[PDB]
């Protein structure tokens, strides 16, 4: 209960709880580094642009 050198529960948390979050943080950190490109932000614009340029065509073909 107090916390001995090799307490099964407490010692397990030291390596599990800590490392697990470390990897999780790395994913976000490394993931944000790969998403810093300015061309990826242009793709977002494309998506919004593509849905409005096709809409007109879609509405034009469906009209008749």
């Amino acid at each position: 209960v107090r916390g001995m050198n090799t307490s099964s529960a407490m010692s397990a948390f030291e390596r599990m709880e800590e490392k697990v979050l470390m990897q999780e943080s790395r994913a976000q950190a490394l993931g944000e580094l790969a998403g810093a490109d300015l061309e990826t932000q242009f793709a977002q614009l494309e998506g919004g642009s593509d849905v409005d340029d096709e809409l007109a065509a879609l509405k034009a073909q469906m009209l008749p």
């Binding site: 709880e17 990897q23 999780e24 994913a27």
Partner: protein, 51 residues
């Protein structure tokens, strides 16, 4: 009698301490599932991001 009461109260503490330990071990089981889900998810992104 004196010794009895003293030990009786000491036994109560032990019994009451086991009740709190029953919930502490139950919490560990819950962590297992959540931890594994976070690990796999991060491990799956460790290869994708690398490539």
């Amino acid at each position: 009698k004196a010794s009895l009461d003293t030990q009786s109260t000491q036994v109560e503490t032990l019994k009451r301490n086991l009740i709190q330990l029953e919930s502490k071990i139950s919490e560990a089981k819950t962590k297992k599932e959540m931890l594994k889900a976070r690990i796999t998810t991060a491990k799956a992104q460790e290869q994708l991001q690398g490539m």
